Each structure stands twice: as structure tokens, then as C-alpha cells.
């Protein structure tokens, strides 16, 4: 069945940066349109970046636009978020995370998720 | 701005039910795709269901099917979870959800979140 394993994350101070991986298997990340979504406590769900299935064009949420980039390797199929310029404010737990109707499979998957944090 | 406002939540006890509301400001329910999404205590999100499509066809957790309803009343642009047969397993903070796509690919959306505790 399908599955989406999230690493990377962890602990940093601002200006850092952090890349997280997620490792699909049981489909192709190519095939899907997939994400990531954040989650604070107070600021609920959040998508923080997209990429949509074929021509490989890219949503970002306004607050991360220049410093996070979402992108694939096909033959790993690994979906990533390169984390650049961190500020306190992104500290969330991050879902790799198919769109609410993917593909394939009738309801919507989630990674299990990755704390990212970010303080002096 | 699109908006989704959750209410309808709080404690029951287990055997009982409890409808989820999701007012939808800024766009219409009726077209668009939707959805809810549920964290337990400690664990991760998880799809609980959606409705979507051109014929309003509705999809559910393995876990909640036969228990849970989604619906949408479109007078009152208003999502709903009608939640019977309620578990310890339901215990969990609920965000509405939908995905709109005014440019050929889907843009997505979450409420606040409204805790449900089942004891």
C-alpha cells in the first residue's frame, strides 16, 4: 500500500537551514500532485509548498517564497523541501502529504511528520 | 479570502454522536472539492473523509466507515460530519478542508482546527 516517510528536520538557530526528504513508495511522486503542509499549535494547517503532477510547476505560500524550494528526484522517488533563510515563525511539525483527491487511491495520505524548529 | 470556521465540538461520551460544522466563507461548497482531517493525541494527521468530484461522491477511512457522514447543505454553505458511534479512537482536533483550483490546479485550505474528546 501506499506510504510517504518523512527525514530531516530536527533543531537549528535563524539564518539556518534544513532539507526535508520524503520517501514515497508503493506509487510514483511523479504521477502525483504532492506537498508539504505545517502545523503550529494556534495557526492550525498551513500548505507551504506544492508540486503538481506533470509539468512540475511549483506552488509557495507568500511567507516562504525565496527561501523554500519543493522538488523531486524521480529515480529516488523523493520528494524534498529545502529549507533556506529559517525564521522562528516556520517552527512546525511538517506533512509530506498527497492533494485531498489523489491519483490513485480514493482519500488523501500523510507522512507521519517532522519537526522542524527553529530558535536562538 | 477563502475561510473555513469550524464548530460543534466538545466532549461525549463514547456510544454517543456529534456533528462537526464547517461554514465556508469566500467561495461556494457546492462545486468545490472538501474534506475533514483528524490528529490524534500524539499521533499524526490522517484523511477522515472528502467529497469530491463532479457527482458529490463521498470516500472514508477504513476505520470510520458506516459511522461517519459527510454532507454538504448548500443553503447554508455549510460542510458537515455527522459523527455516530463514537470512540476513544475519535479522540482528536478536526480541520475542515477544501481545495479550490481557479487556475487549472488545486490551491489548498484548513480551519482552526476543533478538538472532539470521547471518555
Known amino acids: 500500500e501506499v506510504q510517504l516517510l518523512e527525514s530531516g528536520g530536527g533543531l537549528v538557530q535563524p539564518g539556518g537551514s534544513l532539507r526535508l526528504s520524503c520517501?514515497?513508495?508503493?506509487?510514483?511522486?511523479?504521477?502525483?500532485?504532492?506537498?508539504?503542509v505545517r502545523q503550529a499549535p494556534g495557526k492550525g494547517l498551513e500548505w507551504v509548498s506544492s508540486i503538481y503532477g506533470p509539468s512540475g510547476s511549483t506552488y509557495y505560500a507568500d511567507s516562504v517564497k525565496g527561501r523554500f524550494t519543493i522538488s523531486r528526484d524521480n529515480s529516488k522517488n523523493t520528494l524534498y523541501l529545502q529549507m533556506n533563510s529559517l525564521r522562528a515563525e516556520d517552527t512546525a511539525v511538517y506533512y509530506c502529504a498527497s492533494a485531498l483527491e489523489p491519483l490513485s487511491e480514493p482519500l488523501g495520505f500523510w507522512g507521519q511528520g517532522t519537526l522542524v524548529t527553529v530558535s536562538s | 479570502e477563502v475561510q473555513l470556521l469550524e464548530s460543534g465540538g466538545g466532549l461525549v461520551q463514547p456510544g454517543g454522536s456529534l456533528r462537526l460544522s464547517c461554514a465556508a466563507s469566500?467561495?461556494?461548497?457546492?462545486?468545490?472539492?472538501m474534506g475533514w482531517v483528524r490528529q490524534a493525541p500524539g499521533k499524526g494527521l490522517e484523511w477522515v473523509s472528502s467529497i469530491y468530484g463532479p457527482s458529490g461522491s463521498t470516500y472514508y477511512a477504513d476505520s470510520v466507515k458506516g459511522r461517519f457522514t459527510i454532507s454538504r447543505d448548500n443553503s447554508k454553505n455549510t460542510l458537515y460530519l455527522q459523527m455516530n458511534s463514537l470512540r476513544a479512537e475519535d479522540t482528536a482536533v478536526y480541520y475542515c478542508a477544501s481545495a479550490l483550483e481557479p487556475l487549472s490546479e488545486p490551491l489548498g485550505f484548513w480551519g482552526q482546527g476543533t478538538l472532539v474528546t470521547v471518555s
Open positions: 469566500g467561495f461556494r461548497i457546492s462545486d468545490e472539492d
